[PDB]
Structure formats: C-alpha cells, structure tokens
C-alpha cells in the first residue's frame with residue numbers, strides 16, 4: 001500500500017538493536033573525488049531497491065569517524081547514508097550546510113551506479129552533530145524540498161529558524177556544555193513554526209559527545225523520524241506520537257512535538 005515501506009513491522013527492540021535488518025556495504029568517497037566537501041563514506045543496503053538518502057555532517061574539529069556508527073545504523077534500516085568529512089575541520093555551520101548539500105548531490109549524480117541506483121532522489125534528509133546540526137538547520141532552511149532534518153546536539157549562532165518547514169527532530173543533551181540546550185537546541189525548536197511537523201527530544205544524562213557513542217535512543221528516534229517522513233511510513237508514527245515519556249520512570253529528559261503530524 002505504501003511502496004516506500006522497507007523492512008519489517010517495527011518494535012522498540014528492533015529499533016533499539018545495534019543494527020536493523022538490512023545488510024550494509026560501503027562506498028568510499030575520496031577527498032579528490034568529492035566536489036564541495038571533504039569526502040566520506042556512503043553506507044547503503046546490499047539488497048537492490050530504491051531508498052531514501054541522507055547526508056550527515058560531523059562537528060567542529062571532528063571527522064566522519066565520530067558519526068560512523070550512525071551512518072551504518074541508519075543504512076541498516078533501509079537508507080543510503082553518507083557520513084562526510086568537511087573541507088577543513090574548522091568549517092563553520094553555514095559552510096557545513098553547503099557541504100552537506102554537495103554530499104547529497106554527490107550521492108545522486110557522481111557516485112557509482114551501485115549507489116545511484118539505490119537512491120530515490122526525490123526523498124532526501126539531512127543530519128549533523130553539533131556544528132553539523134546547525135548545518136542541518138541551515139540546509140533545511142535553504143531546501144524546503146528536503147523530507148526530514150535531524151540536528152543532533154546542534155550548535156549555531158543564529159537562533160531563528162522560523163524559515164524551516166522541513167519536518168525537523170532536534171535532539172538535545174541535558175549535560176551538553178558545548179551547545180547548552182538553553183541557548184541552542186531549545187531556541188532552535190521554539191523558533192521553528194508551530195505549524196510544521198517537529199519534535200524536541202532531550203537526552204537524560206548525556207553530554208555533547210552522546211551522538212558520537214552508539215545510542216539506543218538516538219538510533220531509535222532518528223530512524224523513526226526518517227521512516228515517518230522520508231518514507232511516509234506511518235508504521236513509525238506510534239513511536240513519535242505521543243513519543244517517549246519524559247515523566248516518572250520515563251525514557252527521556254524532555255519530549256515535545258506537534259503531533260499529530
């Protein structure tokens with residue numbers, strides 16, 4: 001009925017497991033072969049089919065190695081995913097937005113036929129850690145056509161994202177001292193329009209490095225957000241609405257959303 005649906009009916013366990021049901025292979029993108037970004041790695045399902053496609057940026061001073069687990073994990077749930085390196089490790093968020101865009105174009109137009117043939121170029125998403133999460137917000141602002149955006153403990157000097165209409169899940173870390181939720185993640189969420197699909201998920205007992213460490217909660221809700229909005233997979237609505245509990249015995253520090261979507 002939904003021909004974008006991939007993989008079996010989800011459960012909390014299946015979404016929290018280290019890997020989804022899709023076996024993954026990798027395509028290396030050298031710095032030489034990459035135009036407008038610093039290279040990286042494309043994770044893609046071996047099983048032949050078309051899938052949504054996602055570009056993920058690391059943060060300030062970091063490289064693809066700090067987000068690799070996420071590229072692999074998301075790809076194993078039926079997506080084509082590039083973890084990029086940036087032209088330099090010091091690139092600012094809005095430069096990171098340009099490089100994410102170049103990485104989307106690389107996957108669609110310049111990668112091998114194996115990778116290009118597994119991408120539905122009409123169904124794209126963007127994600128990033130810290131400064132790359134700020135890059136996610138900027139690119140979502142510049143490309144309303146993106147299907148989803150997921151800034152992870154994002155950092156950005158601009159606090160006004162009222163131009164974004166892409167379905168956006170922001171993930172904050174309560175103990176983040178680099179991009180404190182009070183001055184980055186939450187102001188971002190609050191400046192997004194009340195009229196779009198969005199969610200704020202704040203992790204309990206998590207620092208700025210949490211998205212760099214394999215994380216059941218990040219893995220679960222990133223994939224659920226991507227499934228719901230990249231694939232239009234309403235089987236995943238059950239995890240986003242009402243969403244993880246932030247109350248007594250709950251799983252998150254805070255969850256807020258514009259459910260129903």
Ligand SMILES: O=C(O)c1ccc(C(=O)OCCO)cc1
Nearest residue numbers: 059060061062130131132155178
């Ligand atoms: O000190 C800062 O202002 C500052 C420090 C770090 C970051 C960031 O993106 O870290 C990601 C590391 O992978 C952003 C801002």
